[PDB]
Amino acid sequence: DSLRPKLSEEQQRIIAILLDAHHKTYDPTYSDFCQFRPPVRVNDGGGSVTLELSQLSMLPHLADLVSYSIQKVIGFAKMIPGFRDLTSEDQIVLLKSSAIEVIMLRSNESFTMDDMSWTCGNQDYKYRVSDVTKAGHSLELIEPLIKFQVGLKKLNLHEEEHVLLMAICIVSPDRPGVQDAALIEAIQDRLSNTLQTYIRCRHPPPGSHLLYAKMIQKLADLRSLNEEHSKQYRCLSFQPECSMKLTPLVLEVFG
Ligand X SMILES: C[C@H](CCCC(C)(C)O)[C@H]1CC[C@@H]2C(/C=C/C3=C[C@@H](O)[C@@H](CCCO)[C@H](O)C3)=CCC[C@@]21C
CB closer to ligand X out of 129 and 186? 129
SS (H, E, C) the chain: CCCCCCCCHHHHHHHHHHHHHHHHHCCCCCCCHHHCCCCCCCCCCCCCHHHHHHHCCCHHHHHHHHHHHHHHHHHHHHCCCCHHHCCHHHHHHHHHHHHHHHHHHHHHHCEECCCCEEECCCCCCEECHHHHHCCCCCHHHHHHHHHHHHHHHCCCCCHHHHHHHHHHHHCCCCCCCCCCHHHHHHHHHHHHHHHHHHHHHHCCCCCHHHHHHHHHHHHHHHHHHHHHHHHHHHHHHCCCCHHHHCCHHHHHHHC
Contacting residue, 11, 91, 110, 188, with ligand X by CB under 6 A: 110
Instruction: Name residues contacting ligand X, limited to 3-62 (CB under 6 A).
Output: 26-27, 62
Spell out, one character per residue from 113 to 142, where the chain touches ligand X: x when CB under 6 A holds, - when not.
Answer: -----x-x------x----x--x-------
Closest to ligand X by CB, 66 vs 80, is: 66
Nearer to ligand X, 2 or 31 (CB): 31
Least distance from C-beta 248 to ligand X, angstroms?
Answer: 13
- Quick note: the x/- pattern for ligand X over 52-71, rule CB under 6 A, is ----------xx-xx--x--
Q: Which of 22, 106, 200, 218 binds ligand X (CB under 6 A)?
A: 106
Return binding residues for calcitriol: 26, 69, 106, 110, 137, 229
Q: Which residues bind to ligand X, rule: CB under 6 A?
A: 26-27, 62-63, 65-66, 69, 72, 103-104, 106-107, 109-110, 118, 120, 127, 132, 135, 229, 233, 250
